[PDB]
């Protein structure tokens, strides 16, 4: 179960629905997550044909794995815009090659 294994990469799901990634989503996400530690990179990818509570995936690569662990514990189950956010980890090497649709 990839999502359960701590890494520098945090995956946020259910932030917004399919086709709903507005112009402010990335900055709203990034600037909140910097409170857990320095964020190195943010990728938003929408999985074609996926369900609405799963299509939009937001990846944050932290500089420290310690910051990433803080993020997951705080962000999992947290509200964002009326939705319950799912937060977990993602494999670093898959993230670095943009293999972004793996089951977590």
């Amino acid at each position: 179960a990839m999502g359960k294994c701590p890494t520098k990469v945090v995956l946020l799901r259910n932030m917004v629905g399919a086709g709903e990634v507005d112009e402010d989503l990335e900055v709203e996400t990034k600037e909140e997550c910097e409170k857990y530690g320095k964020v190195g990179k943010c990728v938003i990818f929408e999985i074609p044909g996926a369900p609405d509570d799963e299509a939009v995936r937001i990846f944050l690569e932290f500089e420290r794995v310690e910051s990433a662990i803080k993020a997951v514990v705080d962000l999992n189950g947290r509200y964002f815009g009326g939705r319950v956010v799912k937060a977990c980890f993602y494999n670093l090497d898959k993230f670095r090659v943009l293999d972004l649709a793996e089951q977590v």
Partner: peptide
């Protein structure tokens, strides 16, 4: 600095 969507309930 409109308030973020963080912690917004339904």
């Amino acid at each position: 600095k409109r308030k973020s969507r963080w912690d917004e309930t339904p």
